């Protein structure tokens, strides 16, 4: 069983809360005492060093909600934007803090691919947990932007395939972590029927 | 030597002085919480330990994100629900680990009203701070979830549906005057665009 890891979790997340909003200095440092017993037990049950624990898993200010994750979504003639990692995944990554889920689409879209893109449409909010489980030390929510492209080029690869386009019939290697089989018929179902429902988990 | 028994024992007992001392209902919810997870985990089997999983954190860079709160738009009779801290706003707050977004949305909605949703509908994705920034320098991205009342029961100061020309004194921070008209313009076209920032 690796269920405890769920727990350790819940005890982190419940631990910076109190330090975040409890107002009472005994019960501060009853939280703060918490939270170090859930980097212990974190430390303990993953082999990892305590302090590379704190540091990766409870060095957040504030309530403890889940990461934000972006997918750009880029169609051109029925063939959806891949870029190569050897797996493929949608253009993004995670949400920069100073930034607005479309801008990190934008940003992304251009690092990754060369292209320039705007009209932003909000075509999905998937669960990372839900859809590619993995045991994880944090939760993810993934937001799913299409843009148009309006500007720029893509980007060529010298020998290699790394930027690409592709049909629905002709999917490469997918990165399962960063996108799952059914989130990208999810998209083409959308490109199909621009009109449908957008999915939330 | 089984290490986990220890740890949870010391977590129940934090966790009992803090419920047994504390006078702030969210403190002694939180303390509340914590007793209820560490006797779940105290009513495993004592004489066998916890599975090692190495590199849980390789991939891991403690890469920080904007939060996320949710807000529930939840509309009978073409009035829409609000809760009363004396500042009003719809149900909803921080998401949690472990939850998905609607999971998030129906919980809050249940525990600030007795009210169970379900059909849950995206409406719009708001950066927090194109609408209600403060000095504070915490980055949110606020989701809005449609839903419909099933069942539950009605259940704080007052929790109260309001029309569109009656609308009560809001919470800006948690929701814009702007942002809760949008959402009356979403109940009166169903197809309308979603709204992301």
Redesign the interface.
Request: net charge neutral.
């Given at each position: 069983?690796?269920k405890?890891?769920?727990?350790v979790?819940?005890?982190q997340?419940?631990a910076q809360?109190?330090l975040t909003?409890?107002?009472?200095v005994?019960?501060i440092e009853?939280?703060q005492?918490?939270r170090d017993?859930s980097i212990?037990?974190?430390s303990?049950?993953?082999?990892?060093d305590w302090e590379?624990?704190e540091?990766?898993?409870a060095?957040?200010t504030?309530?403890?909600?889940?990461?934000?994750?972006i997918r750009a979504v880029v169609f051109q003639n029925e063939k959806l934007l891949f870029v190569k990692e050897g797996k493929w995944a949608l253009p993004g990554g995670?949400?920069?803090?100073?930034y607005?889920?479309?801008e990190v689409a934008a940003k992304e879209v251009f690092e990754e691919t060369g292209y320039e893109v705007d009209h932003?449409?909000?075509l999905?909010?998937f669960?990372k947990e839900?859809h590619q489980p993995s045991?994880?030390?944090?939760?993810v929510?993934k937001?799913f932007?299409g843009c148009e492209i309006i500007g720029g080029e893509k980007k060529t690869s010298i020998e290699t395939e790394e930027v690409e386009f592709f049909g629905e019939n002709e999917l490469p290697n997918l990165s399962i972590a960063r996108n799952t089989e059914d989130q990208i018929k999810e998209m083409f179902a959308y490109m199909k029927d621009p009109?449908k429902?957008?999915?939330?988990?």
């Open positions: 069983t690796i405890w890891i769920d727990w979790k819940q005890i997340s419940i809360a109190g909003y409890s107002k009472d005994y019960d009853r939280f005492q918490l017993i212990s037990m974190m303990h049950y993953t082999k990892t590379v624990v540091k990766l898993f060095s957040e504030g309530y403890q909600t889940p990461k934000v994750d995670w949400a920069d803090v100073g607005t889920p479309t932003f449409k909000l999905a909010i669960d839900k045991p994880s030390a944090t939760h929510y937001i932007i009109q429902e957008k999915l939330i988990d």
